[PDB]
Amino acid sequence: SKPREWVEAVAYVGPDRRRFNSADYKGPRKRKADAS
Ligand SMILES: Nc1nc2c(ncn2[C@@H]2O[C@@H]3COP(=O)(O)O[C@H]4[C@@H](O)[C@H](n5cnc6c(=O)[nH]c(N)nc65)O[C@@H]4COP(=O)(O)O[C@H]3[C@H]2O)c(=O)[nH]1
Numbered sequence: 001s002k003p004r005e006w007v008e009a010v011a012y013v014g015p016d017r018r019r020f021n022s023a024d025y026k027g028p029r030k031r032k033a034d035a036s
């Protein structure tokens with residue numbers, strides 16, 4: 001009805017669309033969390 005998993009951004013408001021993670025990803029990266 002109302003669980004955790006909540007991200008609040010100015011243009012996006014709602015739960016995180018991320019649930020998959022490929023360390024063998026072949027293509028352009030654009031996620032802030034991909035920074036060391
Ligand atoms: N198709 C696709 N594009 C990807 C993916 N990962 C990153 N991107 C792209 O990278 C951009 C990073 O925007 P940001 O302002 O640095 O930072 C992001 C981020 O901080 C936040 N944000 C919005 N939606 C999400 C979300 O579902 N998850 C997370 N973790 N942050 C989000 O709002 C900012 C603006 O997001 P956008 O305008 O959507 O812009 C996103 C999006 O176009 C992915 O897996 N698939």
Ligand SMILES: Nc1nc2c(ncn2[C@@H]2O[C@@H]3COP(=O)(O)O[C@H]4[C@@H](O)[C@H](n5cnc6c(=O)[nH]c(N)nc65)O[C@@H]4COP(=O)(O)O[C@H]3[C@H]2O)c(=O)[nH]1
Pocket residue numbers: 017018019020021022025028029030031034
């Ligand atoms: N490290 C990294 N991996 C990336 C990036 N863009 C795509 N991927 C990978 O490619 C898959 C396909 O993304 P999609 O078809 O754009 O579809 C994405 C996208 O539409 C959405 N999404 C997630 N986070 C964001 C975000 O921050 N912004 C936007 N606009 N969409 C997001 O969630 C969907 C999840 O797709 P999946 O097939 O489960 O998993 C994602 C993810 O494993 C990226 O910038 N960095």
